[PDB]
Write a protein that binds this DNA or RNA. Structure first.
Ligand SMILES: Nc1ncnc2c1ncn2[C@@H]1O[C@H](COP(=O)(O)OP(=O)(O)O)[C@@H](O)[C@H]1O
Ligand code: ALF
Ligand SMILES: [Mg+2]
Ligand SMILES: [Zn+2]
Length: 661
RNA sequence: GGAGCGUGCCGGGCACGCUCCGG
């Protein structure tokens, strides 16, 4: 299959060496077009080196095996893999290759590197191909790489690589006016240093349907959770507490209350707020999947549990546990979201032939939908072979899927060994399954880019796209708005394409200049906030029992990421709990040791890091209240702390530790 | 499981997600 006319046309500017964005519909074959650009680019001058940037782990392998491998007749093409069992540094890999395919953060790491073997410059490439280039916005890695490109361009750096952006959907960036949308397109062009947006000016699409579901007539499971939540809030004895149970707003307010209580050391308020968040999580789960999924959320929280507040809460759950379980087994109170999804799958998987992705928000939700499908008698004998697909995201609630684990599911899905995926947003862009003919979006609240992309996974002739949402909801509204935003985005792109060259050029220079200036201001602002306090005047307190445990001056950063306490006497404040934590990925310089906890109350603090031949405690900031002479604050991220932290030195630490004994 | 980022949401937060951690 040689290139279609539209492909050749879309890459004509790139073939003349112009920076461009190729804007072609989902599944139009932007990738093969880009490969052709790389072939002629590399042919047209020796010494050329191409970087192909992607934004999902599995796209590295997909792009190699289905497209970029054809360049191996004449050129060396390397796909970066986190699973290589002969690992070297990026610079070595890239400098010894004609084409390097990697996730963008791999390149950004190399572009910022200290060590000489790993270091790379933008000038070491003659072409950057940026897949799904609509992510080249704000502080995403695509935009960090390109902001550096702009800085260099504006200072008169020469032989910067050519830029080839690929996307189906620049988006409108929240803008709902023509003027706004046009400005957003220009901002994307500015970010990517685009000379021309090239399209097919001179690919089937699915029939779309709204599968609306009504609120549950009777929800005694949810009602009972709400009654319990009211009881806990009465026990807290506080006026003006929120009543809007089962909402993300209540979730926010109750965690904010939890944080204020942590900051003032209000133990009873904080612990009750903690548990209330869990009950609220259960309501959200109840509204999204099965009652029993919501029950298991609460049950696992209380199974792993003295203090009279915490025993009041244990007692309160125990008093309702059996009733909650029995209600959860009752077919009468089934989730209409799930009934609707059953109808859809019953209709489209009769007779095997259908090849579907059901998109859901959370990793947990994907797993719960699979279990639901496997427990649903109405869907048996339909030859539905389903699996979960998630990305590499990870949390206590739900672990991720590694590169290989993702690839295993995708490869079986490709020819129908599996015929249905329950997927997170990991598979909304880029994934190419020619036989996929059904996409269902299950109660999602996304922008128009995610809508267009997810729809686009249905590659087949006569594909179907279903919006499964609650009737009269914000989800339905946002889907309808998003549809109009696609049309508006298209209008905006056409206006930028027809813009007088001189007016376009002046506008790009202006946006680029403002971008590089705004970055400098943001950087200076971040530095000032970081220098507000002497580290010696910052104390860390255990969030549970409020005991003082270390100071800011005890903290160092290992590998510009991991915040460790280097004080030899800090070991008297934490206790190591048995059980080595195991990650799937093994690192070069370290592995995780055991979890650490507060030695005076057993509150979780973080974990051991076995860094070369020493063991260092990593402190997770969320388990502490940070106290300065001005305020007490609960932090989510280390990056918002207002004292400076020095980089860890291994040599200096080893030297100082071998003094006492 | 630490970090980076994004999306949704609320008047700087909340939630979720993806990515990085020798490729
Ligand atoms: N000229 C062509 N002839 C036949 N098939 C093609 C051609 N160009 C691309 N394809 C195929 O079309 C499918 C979609 O291409 P892909 O690059 O994933 O689309 P996107 O533009 O969304 O990245 C792939 O299976 C690809 O191999
Ligand atoms: F790049 Al696409 F669907 F637009 F994989
Ligand atoms: Mg693609
Ligand atoms: Zn403690």
């Amino acid at each position: 299959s040689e290139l279609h006319g539209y492909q050749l046309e879309a890459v004509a500017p790139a073939l003349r060496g112009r920076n461009s964005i190729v804007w072609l519909p989902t599944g139009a074959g932007k990738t093969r077009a880009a490969v052709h650009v790389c072939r002629r680019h590399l042919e047209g001058r020796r010494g050329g080196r191409v970087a192909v940037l992607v934004n999902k782990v599995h796209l590295v392998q997909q792009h190699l095996e289905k497209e970029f491998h054809v360049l191996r007749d004449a050129f060396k093409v390397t796909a970066v893999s986190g699973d290589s069992s002969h690992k070297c540094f990026f610079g070595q890999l890239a400098k010894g290759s004609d084409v390097v395919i990697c996730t963008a953060q791999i390149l950004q790491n190399a572009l910022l590197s200290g060590e000489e073997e790993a270091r790379v410059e933008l000038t070491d490439f003659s072409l950057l191909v940026i897949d799904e280039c609509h992510h080249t916005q704000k502080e995403a890695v695509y935009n960090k790489i390109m902001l550096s490109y702009l800085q260099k361009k504006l200072s008169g750096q020469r032989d910067l690589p050519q830029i080839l952006g690929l996307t189906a959907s620049p988006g409108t960036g929240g803008e709902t006016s023509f003027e706004g949308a046009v400005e957003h397109i220009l901002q994307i062009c500015a970010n990517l240093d685009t000379e021309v947006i090239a399209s097919a000016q001179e690919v089937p699409q699915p029939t779309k349907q709204y599968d609306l579901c009504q609120e549950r007539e009777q929800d005694p499971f949810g009602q009972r959770l709400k009654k319990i939540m009211a009881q806990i809030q009465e026990h807290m004895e506080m006026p003006e507490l929120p009543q809007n149970f089962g909402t993300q707003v209540y979730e926010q307010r109750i965690v904010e209350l939890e944080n204020r209580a942590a900051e003032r050391f209000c133990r009873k308020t904080r612990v009750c707020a903690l548990h209330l968040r869990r009950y609220n999580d259960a309501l959200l789960i109840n509204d999204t999947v099965r009652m029993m999924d919501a029950f298991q959320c609460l049950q696992q929280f209380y199974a792993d549990k003295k203090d009279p507040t915490e025993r009041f809460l244990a007692t309160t759950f125990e008093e309702n546990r059996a009733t909650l379980q029995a209600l959860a087994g009752d077919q009468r109170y089934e989730n209409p979201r799930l009934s609707k999804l059953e109808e859809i799958l019953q209709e489209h998987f009769q007779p095997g032939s259908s090849r579907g992705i059901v998109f859901t928000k959370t990793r947990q939700s994907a797993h719960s939908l699979l279990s639901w499908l496997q427990d649903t008698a109405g869907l048996c004998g339909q030859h539905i072979r389903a699996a979960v697909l998630t990305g590499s995201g990870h949390s206590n609630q739900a672990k991720g899927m590694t590169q290989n684990e993702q690839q295993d599911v995708i490869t079986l899905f490709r020819y129908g060994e599996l015929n249905l995926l329950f997927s997170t947003s990991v598979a909304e862009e880029g994934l190419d399954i020619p036989e996929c003919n059904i996409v269902v979006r299950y109660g999602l609240m996304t922008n128009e880019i995610a809508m267009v992309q997810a729809q686009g996974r249905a590659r087949a002739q006569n594909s179907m796209y279903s919006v499964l949402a609650k009737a009269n909801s914000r989800e339905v509204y946002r889907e309808q708005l998003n549809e109009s935003l696609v049309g508006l985005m298209e209008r905006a792109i056409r206006a930028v394409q027809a813009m007088p060259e001189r007016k376009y050029r002046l506008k790009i220079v202006e946006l680029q200049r403002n971008a590089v200036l705004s970055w400098q201001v943001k950087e200076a602002r971040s530095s000032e906030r970081r220098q507000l306090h002497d580290p010696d005047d910052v104390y860390f307190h255990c969030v549970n029992c409020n005991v003082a445990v270390c100071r800011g001056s005890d903290i160092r950063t290992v590998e510009a990421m991991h915040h460790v306490n280097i004080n030899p006497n800090f070991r008297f404040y934490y206790t190591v709990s048995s059980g080595k934590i195991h990650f799937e990925r093994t690192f070069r310089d370290w592995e995780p040791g055991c979890r650490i906890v507060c030695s005076e109350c057993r509150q979780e603090w973080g974990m051991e890091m076995i860094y070369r031949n020493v063991t260092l405690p990593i402190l997770s900031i969320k388990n502490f209240v940070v106290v300065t002479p001005d305020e007490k604050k609960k932090y989510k991220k280390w990056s918002t702390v207002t004292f400076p932290i020095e980089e860890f030195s291994y040599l200096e630490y080893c030297s100082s530790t071998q003094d006492e004994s």
